[PDB]
């Protein structure tokens, strides 16, 4: 409907796949080459389904900060025959607050879904499902089951992936450029 939705659509149409693990279907963001991200609670194994194709996992790393605290981001390298468009230049360098963000989801349950969530707070610490978690962004939208892995964007930036909610607020794990240096 507007330039926020335009940026979000451009990321969904070229940089997302549907990932299936034993713990469900997730929106998965492809970042560059065969490297993608997914919430750590997806419990990625040796094999994953990518758009319903059996795919070997070449590497999977559940990220933690240098306090050895959960970040809820798993970086996956896929044995896929095609590279992602490189979107690393759209990743923020620093922890920050944002205005006017969109949460975008693409699954069998929620195809072509876009939610204007508004203001995003650098929330920081969250007890996420019992797990102490750092680098959490918060938005005041009643997000539901099925939105985990959803991409959070502003006009110009890919800033996080949806990882949970409390019924009134939704929470995303930050994406930072430093996670994807090579
Ligand atoms: O400076 S950024 O936040 N991150 C870049 C990562 C590689 C070089 C800088 C950039 C994000 C997109 O909007 C314009 C600013």
- Tell me if 82 sits within 8 A of 39, measured CB to CB: no
- Tell me if 24 sits within 8 A of 42, measured CB to CB: yes
Cα 73 to Cα 173: distance, rounded to the nearest angstrom: 7
Question: Is 41 one of the annotated active-site residues of the chain?
Answer: yes
DSSP 3-state of 167 = coil
Nearest to 92 by CA among 4, 16, 160, 161: 160
Q: Which residues of 47-70 are buried (b: 16+ CB within 10 A; e: fewer)?
A: ebebeeeebebeebeebeeeeeeb
Rg (CA), the chain: 15
Extract the tokens encoding 87: 């979107």
Cα 60 to Cα 154: distance, rounded to the nearest angstrom: 27
Q: Please work out whether the CB of residue 77 comes within 6 Å of at least one atom of ligand 1.
A: no
Q: What are phi and psi of 42, to 5 degrees?
A: -65, -20
Give the DSSP per-residue string, 26-55. Answer: EEEEEEEBTEEEEEGGG---SEEEETTEEE
**Ligand 1 mean position, distance from CA 90 (Å):** 5
DSSP 3-state of 145 = coil
Q: Technique behind this structure?
A: X-ray
Extract the tokens encoding 77: 């390298």
Q: How big is the CA angle at 32 (ends 29 and 37), to the nearest 5 degrees? A: 30
Residue 121 CB contacts under 8 Å (≥ 6 apart), including other chains:
97, 137, 138, 139
**Ligand 1 mean position, distance from CA 92 (Å):** 5
Q: Please work out whether the CB of residue 89 comes within 6 Å of at least one atom of ligand 1.
A: yes
Extract the tokens encoding 13: 């149409």
Nearest to 175 by CA among 22, 38, 83, 53: 38
Question: Is 72 one of the annotated active-site residues of the chain?
Answer: yes
């Amino acid at each position: 409907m507007g330039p926020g939705f335009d940026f979000a659509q451009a990321i969904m149409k070229k940089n997302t796949v549907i990932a299936r693990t034993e713990k469900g279907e997730f929106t998965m963001l492809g970042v560059y080459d065969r490297v993608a991200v997914i919430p750590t609670h997806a419990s990625v194994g040796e094999i994953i389904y990518i758009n319903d194709v059996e795919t070997r996992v070449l590497d999977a790393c559940a990220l933690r900060d240098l306090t050895d605290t959960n970040l809820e981001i798993t970086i996956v390298k896929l044995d896929r025959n095609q590279k992602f468009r490189d979107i690393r230049h759209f990743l923020p360098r620093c922890e920050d607050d944002y205005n006017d963000a969109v949460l975008s989801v693409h699954t069998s349950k929620f195809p072509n879904m876009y939610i204007p969530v508004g203001q995003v707070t650098n929330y920081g610490f969250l007890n996420l499902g019992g797990t102490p978690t750092h680098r959490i962004l918060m938005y005041n939208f009643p997000t539901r089951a099925g939105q985990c892995g959803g991409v959070v964007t502003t006009t110009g930036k890919v800033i996080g992936i949806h990882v949970g909610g409390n019924g009134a607020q939704g929470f995303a794990a930050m994406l930072l450029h430093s996670y994807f240096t090579d």
